[PDB]
Every structure is written in C-alpha cells, then in structure tokens.
Amino acid sequence: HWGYGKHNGPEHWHKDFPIAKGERQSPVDIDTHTAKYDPSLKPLSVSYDQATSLRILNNGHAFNVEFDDSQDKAVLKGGPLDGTYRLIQFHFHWGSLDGQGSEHTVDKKKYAAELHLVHWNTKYGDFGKAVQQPDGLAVLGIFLKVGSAKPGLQKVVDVLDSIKTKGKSADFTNFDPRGLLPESLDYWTYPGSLTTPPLLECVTWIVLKEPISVSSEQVLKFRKLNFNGEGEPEELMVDNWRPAQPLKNRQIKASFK
Ligand SMILES: O=C(/C=C/c1ccc2c(c1)O[C@@H](c1ccc(O)c(O)c1)[C@@H](C(=O)O)O2)O[C@H](Cc1ccc(O)c(O)c1)C(=O)O
Ligand SMILES: [Zn+2]
C-alpha cells in the first residue's frame, strides 16, 4: 500500500522497504559544479530504430509504455555501460504544479516532470533477474520543462483518456521513443536505485543535461490521470515523485565539459 499520499508517501516507504535508507538510493541532487568530467566514458549509443511498443498501462503510480523486450530491438550501450541494455518500458514522474515534478534535481532545481526509459542488462536474461544485480538496469532520465509542445509526446497524451484509472491498459503499438529525446546526449551518470518500491540498488543512472519542452496542455493531461481504480473516489495522479536522497559515498560523473 505504498504511494505518494501523506500517510503512505516516500517518508513511509522505509518501513516496508528498508533499503529506502540504503547506500545508493535515487534520485539525488546533481550538483553541477561538483560533478567531474570523465574524458574516458565511451560514446553513448541509443539505438531505438527497431523499437516495438506494445501497450500502455496505468499501474496506480504512473503509466508505463511497454515494449517487446524478447529480442535486441531497442538498446542502450556505451557511455558508462558495459554490454547491452534492452528497453522494457518508459514512464514519467510529474507534479501538480509546473514548479515541481522531477525526481532528480539540478543544483536543487526541480523540473515539471522527468521521463525514465528503463533498460535491463541482457547478460541477466530478463528484467526480474537483472533487478537483483548491481549493474542490472540502465535508466535514461530526461527532464521536462513547460514551454513548446513536444510533437513526439502527443500520441501518449491522446491515449491517456482510455487509461484514466488504475489497472486500465490499452494497445499502444508503433510508438517511436526517438521522438522523446533532446538534441544532445550529454549526460551525468552515477550508481543508484529504482525510485519506487522495491527501491532495488540495481541502476546505472544516465541523466541527460538537456531537457525536452512539453506544452502546458500536455502536462495538464497527465494531471487528469487517477491513482484510484474505476468506481473509487477520484484522486488525481499528481506528485508521483520521490525527493532527492543522500548522495553518500558516490560521485556523479559528467560526459561533457
Ligand atoms: O526481483 C524481482 C522483481 C522485482 C520488481 C517487480 C516489479 C517491479 C519492479 C521490480 O520494478 C519497479 C520499477 C520499474 C521501473 C522504475 O523506474 C522503478 O523506479 C521501479 C516496478 C514498476 O514497474 O513500477 O515493477 O523478481 C525476482 C524474480 C523474477 C521475476 C521475474 C523474472 O522474469 C525473473 O527472471 C525473476 C526476484 O524476486 O528475485
Ligand atoms: Zn521512474
């Protein structure tokens, strides 16, 4: 029964998930002046041309756009990564107000939302085995600011009416995640965790410096989703972000400057 309310939100999660107070939790604040440029990271490779989206699901915390991950079709490699990581799903975290919503922060700045493209290390065979390993996942995080519309997001926005409440899904084929990427792939990277329960410490985070722009109308549609199931009292799906966690014994590396 974890969630984002007062009685079940992030400050409570540790009771069911003690790793919430662990040594490599996410998100974190990215102190841009303290991140160090690492000239050895290798180039980062996002290869989404054969991506096969299948479905979109309201899971009661966010919505997931799910991909066919039964072959190497949409993969992330390079950068800090050893080997190849397959795209399984993406989702967002967002606020009730444009002044909050991101999980990572940049010099304490909160963005309106944050996109997570979730990938698992193919050496572990599937996602459920991967999440039990310290290098099991690579999550590409992309900040959203409110300004111009993102054309490549609109297909997602337009289907949300059909998945308003928890447990609803809809077919969502032929969606191209390349339409969600900024121009630059400059990034910060650090070892962390899932940002929702079970909070497993299995993620190499790759957080892009350049945000994408989405329109006020687009984010407003996100905020019409519901945490609740159909036929239950309406609770808008907003503020589904975990705040920054202590950095502890970690260094954030930059791919640039
Ligand atoms: O570890 C797991 C499963 C953990 C898990 C389950 C559901 C999840 C999950 C992890 O990640 C969460 C998640 C995903 C993305 C995020 O950004 C995030 O913050 C949180 C969550 C969600 O989608 O919100 O779903 O299963 C294996 C078994 C097991 C099960 C299945 C298999 O195929 C296998 O080989 C082994 C085991 O229990 O050892
Ligand atoms: Zn996430």
Task: Please report, for the domain that includes residue 212, its CATH number.
Answer: 3.10.200.10
Distance CA 204, CA 173 (A): 28
Q: Which residues contact 46 (CB under 8 A, 6 or more apart)?
A: 76, 140, 181, 185
**What are the structure tokens assigned to 150, written together?**
């993102």
CB 77 within 8 A of CB 135: no
Q: Where are the alpha helices (DSSP H) in 25-72?
A: none
Q: Is the CB of 196 under 6 A from ligand 1?
A: yes
Which is the catalytic residue, given 1, 14, 33, 61?
A: 61
Probe target for ligand 1 pocket from 129, 142, 237, with the most ligand atoms within 8 Å of CB: 129
CA distances from 118 to 66, 136, 207 (A): 10, 11, 12
Probe target for ligand 1 pocket from 57, 88, 121, 196, with the most ligand atoms within 8 Å of CB: 196
Distance CA 141, CA 211 (A): 10
**85 Rama sector, left if φ>0, alpha if ψ -120 to 50, beta otherwise:** beta
C-alpha torsion sign, points 230, 233, 239, 240: negative
Ligand 1 atom with minimal separation from the 125 CA: 35
CB 239 within 8 A of CB 92: no
CB 239 within 8 A of CB 100: yes
244 Cα–ligand 2 center, Å: 13
Q: Whose CA is nearest to atom 30 of ligand 1?
A: 128
Q: Which domain holds residue 35?
A: 1-257
**Residue 229 DSSP class:** P
Distance, first Cα to last Cα, the chain:
43
Distance CA 115, CA 92 (A): 4
CB 12 within 8 A of CB 3: no
Distance CA 252, CA 131 (A): 21
Q: Is the CB of 129 under 6 A from ligand 1?
A: yes
Distance CA 24, CA 30 (A): 14
Q: Tell me, in Å, the resolution of the deposited structure.
A: 1.2
C-alpha torsion sign, points 23, 24, 30, 31: positive
Closest CA to 244 of 252, 235, 254: 252
Q: How many domains does the chain have?
A: 1
C-alpha torsion sign, points 65, 42, 38, 191: positive
Q: Is the CB of 193 under 6 A from ligand 1?
A: no
Establish whether 119 is a catalytic residue: no
**What are the structure tokens assigned to 25, written together?**
């939790």
Q: If you compute the radius of gyration of the chain from its CA atoms, what whole number of angstroms results?
A: 17
**What are the structure tokens assigned to 240, written together?**
């589904």
- Structure obtained using: X-ray
Q: Where are the alpha helices (DSSP H) in the chain?
A: 127-130, 154-159, 216-222
